[PDB]
Amino acid sequence: PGTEQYLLAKQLAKPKEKIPIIVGDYGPMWVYPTSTFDCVVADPRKGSKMYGLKSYIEYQLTPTNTNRSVNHRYKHFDWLYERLLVKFGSAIPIPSLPDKQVTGRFEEEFIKMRMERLQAWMTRMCRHPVISESEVFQQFLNFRDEKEWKTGKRKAERDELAGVMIFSTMEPEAPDLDLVEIEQKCEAVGKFTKAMDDGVKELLTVGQEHWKRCTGPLPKEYQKIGKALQSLATVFSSSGYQGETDLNDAITEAGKTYEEIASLVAEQPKKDLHFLMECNHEYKGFLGCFPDIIGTHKGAIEKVKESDKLVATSKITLQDKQNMVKRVSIMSYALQAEMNHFHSNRIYDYNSVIRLYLEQQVQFYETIAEKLRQALSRFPVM
Amino acid sequence: PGTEQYLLAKQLAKPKEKIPIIVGDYGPMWVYPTSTFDCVVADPRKGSKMYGLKSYIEYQLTPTNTNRSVNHRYKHFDWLYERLLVKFGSAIPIPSLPDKQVTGRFEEEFIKMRMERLQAWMTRMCRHPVISESEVFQQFLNFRDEKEWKTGKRKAERDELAGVMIFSTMEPEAPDLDLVEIEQKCEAVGKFTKAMDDGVKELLTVGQEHWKRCTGPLPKEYQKIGKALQSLATVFSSSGYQGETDLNDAITEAGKTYEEIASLVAEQPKKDLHFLMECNHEYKGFLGCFPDIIGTHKGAIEKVKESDKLVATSKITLQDKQNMVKRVSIMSYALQAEMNHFHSNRIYDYNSVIRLYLEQQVQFYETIAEKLRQALSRFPVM
């Protein structure tokens, strides 16, 4: 990338953007604020900018820290996204913003799932100790003037403390880590993320595959059954046999009961499978970011090996050399700090969605059973 | 066929084979005995007839009416079948004997399902008021000598009171039915049977179709899921993050729990779907028989219209004519008697198998739910 600039920044900077790293039992970690805060996103408003029949949708972001609300069209979130990506992208994975879809810009469904994805996206950022308390993200929320905003959007776009340079604002409340120990922690992350990425990509495929099967061919079956039964009852009823009436009703109902199971089935993924899928997508997103983060640390560590080769070729000085070291260490502390935040949240997230998927599953089968048990109690015992 | 022979039997016969038809509220019906009797078929024996490695399987038929047991190889049942078909085939549907299969003459599975089908086949006959008390069927059971049998098999094969002639042994304890009323009851049966046949053929197709889907692709899914989960837990476990251990166990178990659901699923049709299918096959069998029965009555009724045309062309006499009538009436009474036995049993049969299928279904879903509910109670709440 350009690590040469940060590790060789002969001229140290004078910014007071606070990004500290402390150590702990689990190892380095960011400093999580004591006064936590989230943010709500809802009430799909409708704004206007003079083009006739071209009014973009606008969402409302209500922070919790101060109750003062704000509005934002999707395009602004994308803007926010690029900024966060450009600023911290070389150290912190940045949640993916949903695709730019099927030209269905205006109805219930669309805005709903989109607003759902934006809500989860905002909460991710709010929960991040480093992102949540940055200027760009913050100002993105609390702004009054329609121009107080343009000012921020402008200030944001000129912030040169991005890319690799972001590390220049980090302060490790701990010693230096030799190059060896560094490269090792790098490999580790690189092997975990690649592994989990590969793993979640499957969980996603079978799920999408199972989904597609529960909303299609499977219901049709229970539909064919329930109908097959009902036609048969219809045939018996034409028999014209003295001494029957009670059975053809039980049959016909069994069929209708099956038709309802067809519906119940074809309408279940939206209640459990869905959340399990979404959680995995979000994570496929965090993972997709490591290729860059790790590739940048790798380049940084590789560029520090040439230190000696350089100092000898009289290109730089021992002081310059010793900086490259104390500097690429900060990178490691930041990387470890990030993973520790990852794992922490990973463990919470999967434990909640799975817990959720199962619960929904349970109720599902329990419900179907109860539906059968009803049509059953319509056929006299023998 | 040959109805000309029965309706024009100038020379009445002198047999005392009792086959009476009485009337009732539901209309004509056979005379059902007061001392009912069934028969058991089990204990797959092994007999021998000097060819080396070619020992045919032999079953044991234990009547209930007298506890005196007997043996019979499949080939004998086929023999019994043809006789019953030849003797009463023009009036009573004869249950189909299972196909002659995949050259798997010797193991657990084969003899089991075959013996299951033979058992149900025997019980059908025993339950039939007319068949159960016939000479051929009876002697088929109670015989001691290995030669007392050959005698019967011989007597059976020379019984000319078959085909259309079987009606000659029937005695209606009721008046004559004009030709009109006859043709009408004929059409009716012909329209019901064709209808139900068409109807059961579908129930059979979707069932076979659903079956094939529960024993194949559906389990593989729950298998892919359960594995996808387990690989993921495996990945988390390599994380090397301080502060986790409890989750990877819950996950891994969830997967294994799903794998078991794959098995449970792929092994369910043998517990319910199966009986529902078998019942329908048996009935597709009874129905397949009406094409002949009805075609024979149709020919008989058609041949009676030429009565007048004949009597005038001086071919036969008024007495001959009046016989054809009183005679084709007996046919109608026998046909109605048979249907009434059909409907009676139809209503009982479907009400029991469906009642059975549902019950099994219920327990199925209830069981799966309980399996999930277990893996669930392994993930701590939040």
Distance of CA B366 to the CA centre of its chain: 31
The structure tokens 């007495």 sit at B319
8 A C-beta contact, residue B210 and residue A221: yes
8 A C-beta contact, residue B211 and residue B238: no
Picking from B33, B127, B128, B356, the residue whose alpha carbon sits closest to that of residue A382 is B356
Give the containing element (helix H, strand E) for A39.
strand A39-46
Max distance between CA atoms of chain A, in angstroms, equals 112
Q: Which residues of A touch B192 (CB under 8 A)?
A: 235, 238-240
8 A C-beta contact, residue A124 and residue A81: no
CB atoms B243 and A26 under 8 Å? yes
Give the 3-state secondary structure of B22-47.
Answer: ECCCCCCEECCCCCCCCEEEEEEEEC
Q: Which residues of A touch B268 (CB under 8 A)?
A: none
Quote the CA–CA distance of B187 and B176 in Å, as a whole number: 19
Q: What type of residue sits at position B298?
A: K
CB of B264 within 8 Å of a chain A CB? The answer is no
CB of A232 within 8 Å of a chain B CB? The answer is yes
Q: What are the Cα distances from residue B312, in Å, to B6, B10, B309, B328?
A: 21, 18, 6, 20
Buried b / exposed e along B21-50 (16+ C-beta atoms within 10 A)? beeeeeebbbeeeeeeeebebeeeeeeeee
Which residues, 6 or more positions from A316, have their beta carbon under 8 angstroms from its beta carbon? A8, A307, A310
CB of A224 within 8 Å of a chain B CB? The answer is yes
Neighbours of B211 (CB within 10 A): 17
Q: Is B349 exposed, middle or buried (0-12, 13-18, 19+ CB in 10 A)?
A: middle
Quote the CA–CA distance of A210 and B41 in Å, as a whole number: 45
A320 token code pair: 């310059």
Residue of A nearest to B353 (CA): A382
CB atoms A343 and B241 under 8 Å? yes
Alpha-helix residue ranges (DSSP H) falling in chain A = 4-7, 74-88, 108-126, 135-141, 148-157, 179-214, 217-236, 246-266, 273-288, 290-303, 306-312, 318-376
Residue of B nearest to A342 (CA): B241
Q: What are the Cα distances from residue B290, in Å, to B187, B205, B216, B283, B302?
A: 12, 21, 36, 11, 17
CB atoms A254 and B225 under 8 Å? no
Quote the CA–CA distance of B237 and B139 in Å, as a whole number: 74
User: Parallel, antiparallel, or unpaired: how do β-strands B170-172 and B19-22 relate?
Assistant: parallel
Q: Is B88 exposed, middle or buried (0-12, 13-18, 19+ CB in 10 A)?
A: buried
How close B227 gets to chain A, by Cα (Å)?
9
CB atoms B199 and A376 under 8 Å? no
Which residues, 6 or more positions from A109, have their beta carbon under 8 angstroms from its beta carbon? none
Buried b / exposed e along A323-341 (16+ C-beta atoms within 10 A)? bbbebbbbbbbbbbbbbbb
Q: At what angle do helices A273-288 and A318-376 cross, to 10 degrees?
A: 170
Neighbours of B100 (CB within 10 A): 8
Domain range annotation of chain A: 1-32+159-174, 33-158, 175-382
Q: Is A104 exposed, middle or buried (0-12, 13-18, 19+ CB in 10 A)?
A: exposed
CA angle A292, A297, A298 (to 5 degrees): 95
CB of A45 within 8 Å of a chain B CB? The answer is no
Between the two ends of chain A, the Cα-to-Cα distance in Å is 79
The structure tokens 């805060």 sit at A37
Give the containing element (helix H, strand E) for A59.
strand A57-63
Between the two ends of chain B, the Cα-to-Cα distance in Å is 79
Q: How many Å is the Cα radius of gyration of chain B?
A: 29
8 A C-beta contact, residue B162 and residue B91: no
CB of B362 within 8 Å of a chain A CB? The answer is yes
Neighbours of B160 (CB within 10 A): 7
Nearest to A369 among B229, B339, B366 (CB): B366
Within 13 Å and on the Cβ side, how many CA atoms surround B333? Answer: 27
8 A C-beta contact, residue A192 and residue B238: yes
A177 token code pair: 């880590």
DSSP letters spanning A152-174: HHHHHHT----GGGGGGGEEESS
B318 token code pair: 């008024």
Neighbours of A21 (CB within 10 A): 21
Long-range CB contacts (within 8 A, 24+) of A164-167: A164/A1, A164/A2, A164/A3, A164/A5, A164/A6, A164/A90, A164/A296, A164/A300, A165/A5, A165/A6, A165/A9, A166/A19, A166/A87, A166/A88, A166/A90, A166/A91, A167/A6, A167/A90, A167/A91, A167/A327, A167/A330, A167/A331, A167/A334
How close A207 gets to chain B, by Cα (Å)?
7
B343 token code pair: 């409907």
Resolution (A): 3.0
Long-range CB contacts (within 8 A, 24+) of A180-184: A181/A332, A182/A301, A182/A328, A182/A329, A182/A331, A182/A332, A183/A301
A329 token code pair: 């260490």
Picking from A320, A328, A327, the residue whose alpha carbon sits closest to that of residue A297 is A328
Q: What are the Cα distances from residue B220, in Å, to A126, B216, B250, B258, B376?
A: 41, 7, 22, 10, 22
A242 token code pair: 């003295």
Neighbours of A148 (CB within 10 A): 11
Which residues, 6 or more positions from B290, have their beta carbon under 8 angstroms from its beta carbon? B93, B189, B190, B193, B194, B197
Q: What type of residue sits at position A130?
A: V
Q: Which residues of B touch A343 (CB under 8 A)?
A: 239, 241, 243-244
The structure tokens 């792929």 sit at B266
Distance of CA B55 to the CA centre of its chain: 28
Quote the CA–CA distance of B334 and A88 in Å, as a whole number: 92
Q: Is CATH 3.30.1520.10 the right assignment for the domain spanning A33-158?
A: yes
CB of B375 within 8 Å of a chain A CB? The answer is yes
Q: Is B94 exposed, middle or buried (0-12, 13-18, 19+ CB in 10 A)?
A: buried
Per the annotation, does B213 bind a ligand? no
Per the annotation, does A114 bind a ligand? yes
Quote the CA–CA distance of A173 and A152 in Å, as a whole number: 31
Quote the CA–CA distance of B85 and A350 in Å, as a whole number: 67
8 A C-beta contact, residue A264 and residue A258: no
Q: Which residues of B touch A210 (CB under 8 A)?
A: 221, 224-225
CA angle A342, A346, A348 (to 5 degrees): 125
Quote the CA–CA distance of A362 and B376 in Å, as a whole number: 9
Neighbours of A111 (CB within 10 A): 17
- Which residues pair with residue B172 across a beta bridge? B21
3-class secondary-structure state, position A336:
helix
Residue of B nearest to A247 (CA): B351
User: Parallel, antiparallel, or unpaired: how do β-strands B19-22 and A170-172 relate?
Assistant: unpaired
Max distance between CA atoms of chain B, in angstroms, equals 112
Give the 3-state secondary structure of chain B.
Answer: CCCHHHHCCCCCCCCCCCEEEECCCCCCEECCCCCCCCEEEEEEEECCCCCCCCCCEEEEEEECCCCCCEEEEHHHHHHHHHHHHHHHCCCCCCCCCCCCCCCCCCCHHHHHHHHHHHHHHHHHHHCCCCCCCCHHHHHHHCCCCCCHHHHHHHHHHCCCCCHHHHHHHEEECCCCCCHHHHHHHHHHHHHHHHHHHHHHHHHHHHHHHHHHHHCCHHHHHHHHHHHHHHHHHHHHCCCCCCCCCHHHHHHHHHHHHHHHHHHHHHCCHHHCHHHHHHHHHHHHHHHHCHHHHHHHHHHHHHHCCHHHHHHHCCCCCHHHHHHHHHHHHHHHHHHHHHHHHHHHHHHHHHHHHHHHHHHHHHHHHHHHHHHHHHHHCCCCCC
Give the containing element (helix H, strand E) for A71.
strand A70-73
Residue of B nearest to A253 (CA): B354
Distance of CA A32 to the CA centre of its chain: 20
Question: Which among A236, A335, A352 is the top mutation candidate for probing chain B, defined by the most B β-carbons within 10 Å of its own β-carbon?
Answer: A236
- Give φ, ψ of B380 to 5 degrees: -60, 140
How close B338 gets to chain A, by Cα (Å)?
12
Question: Which among A196, A208, A234, A235 is the top mutation candidate for probing chain B, defined by the most B β-carbons within 10 Å of its own β-carbon?
Answer: A235
CB atoms B240 and A375 under 8 Å? no
Quote the CA–CA distance of A21 and B146 in Å, as a whole number: 99
Question: Which among A361, A371, A382 is the top mutation candidate for probing chain B, defined by the most B β-carbons within 10 Å of its own β-carbon?
Answer: A361
- Which residues pair with residue A45 across a beta bridge? A58
* DSSP tag of A177: -
3-class secondary-structure state, position A128:
coil
CB atoms B238 and A195 under 8 Å? yes
CB atoms B26 and A352 under 8 Å? no
Q: Is the C-alpha dihedral spanning A193, A194, A197, A198 positive or negative?
A: negative
Q: Please report the number of interchain residue pairs, chain A to chain B, with beta-carbon separation below 8 angstroms.
A: 175
Quote the CA–CA distance of A326 and A300 in Å, as a whole number: 12
Which residues, 6 or more positions from B203, have their beta carbon under 8 angstroms from its beta carbon? A228, A229, A232, B280
Strands across the sheet containing B70-73: B39-46, B57-63, B70-73
* DSSP tag of A270: G
CB of A212 within 8 Å of a chain B CB? The answer is no
Picking from A192, A167, A191, A166, the residue whose alpha carbon sits closest to that of residue A332 is A167
Strands across the sheet containing B19-22: B29-30, B19-22, B170-172
Q: What are the Cα distances from residue A312, in Å, to A8, A306, A326?
A: 16, 10, 19
Neighbours of A167 (CB within 10 A): 24
Question: Which among A202, A204, A234 is the top mutation candidate for probing chain B, defined by the most B β-carbons within 10 Å of its own β-carbon?
Answer: A202
Per the annotation, does A73 bind a ligand? yes
8 A C-beta contact, residue A157 and residue A82: no
The structure tokens 């992208």 sit at A89
Picking from B284, B262, B278, B265, the residue whose alpha carbon sits closest to that of residue B208 is B278
Q: Obtained via which technique?
A: X-ray
Quote the CA–CA distance of B252 and B378 in Å, as a whole number: 11
Quote the CA–CA distance of A239 and B191 in Å, as a whole number: 9
CB atoms B228 and A236 under 8 Å? no
Q: At what angle do helices A179-214 and A273-288 cross, to 10 degrees?
A: 150
As its CATH architecture, domain B175-382 has Up-down Bundle (1.20)
The structure tokens 């790293």 sit at A21
Buried b / exposed e along A36-51 (16+ C-beta atoms within 10 A)? eeebebeeeeeeeeee
CB of B256 within 8 Å of a chain A CB? The answer is no
Q: Is the C-alpha dihedral spanning B297, B300, B302, B307 positive or negative?
A: negative
Quote the CA–CA distance of A159 and A81 in Å, as a whole number: 15
